[PDB]
Structure 1
Amino acid sequence: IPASEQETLVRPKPLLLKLLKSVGAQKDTYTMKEVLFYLGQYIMTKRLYDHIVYCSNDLLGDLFGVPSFSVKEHRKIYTMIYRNLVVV
């Protein structure tokens, strides 16, 4: 993962936005760095993470389309996030 990826500007789809609205200020456009941070906070505050995040229990599962995933497979995490947003 290159560092430039954090700068990508994105518009969340409603379900991603609903999730971000529980942890951060609402706005139309976010950086990827913000999205990952808010998802990070969402996961830790709700204790979906202990290297596995368990989310069949949670909206996050519907978002990502998985019951769980490893926090170390960053490529796959980006892919799952990307299908819930639009790059601007």
Structure 2
Amino acid sequence: QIPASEQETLVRPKPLLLKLLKSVGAQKDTYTMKEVLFYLGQYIMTKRLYDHIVYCSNDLLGDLFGVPSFSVKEHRKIYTMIYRNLVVV
């Protein structure tokens, strides 16, 4: 399925994603996917976009991902949407 190795991937977020990350404390320009996933996860919970569907129709997350919603259990799909907003190091 999804390898644990993916969490070690080094990435450089594009401007829009970087802006979202910085709203939950992100201080850097290069991150590990583990960091990106956590910061996104915290952005999601603190904004009560989730409580298995995440609703992001009127949130920058929705513009970032290109969807009005998505399931938190569909990890492969989530990884794809995230990569649309970053560059691998």
Query: Which interval holds the TM-score relative to the shorter structure?
Result: over 0.9
Looking at structure 2, the residues matched to 39 and 74 of structure 1 have their Cα atoms a distance apart, in angstroms, of 13
Task: Give TM-score, length-normalised by structure 1.
Answer: 0.98
Match runs of 1:5-84 below 5 Å: 5-84=6-85
Task: Indicate if the aligned counterparts of 2:53 and 2:69 stay in contact, CA closer than 8 A.
Answer: yes
- List structure 1 segments (4+ residues) > 3 angstroms apart after TM superposition: none
Looking at structure 2, the residues matched to 65 and 55 of structure 1 have their Cα atoms a distance apart, in angstroms, of 9
Task: Give TM-score, length-normalised by structure 2.
Answer: 0.97
Task: Indicate if the aligned counterparts of 2:12 and 2:88 stay in contact, CA closer than 8 A.
Answer: yes
Tell me how large the CA RMSD over aligned residues is.
Answer: 0.6
Looking at structure 2, the residues matched to 77 and 34 of structure 1 have their Cα atoms a distance apart, in angstroms, of 15
Unmatched 5+ residue regions in structure 1?
A: none
Task: Indicate if the aligned counterparts of 2:26 and 2:39 stay in contact, CA closer than 8 A.
Answer: no
Displacement of 1:28 in angstroms is: 1.2
Paired residue total:
88
Structure 2 counterpart SS, 1:11: strand
Task: Indicate if the aligned counterparts of 2:65 and 2:82 stay in contact, CA closer than 8 A.
Answer: yes
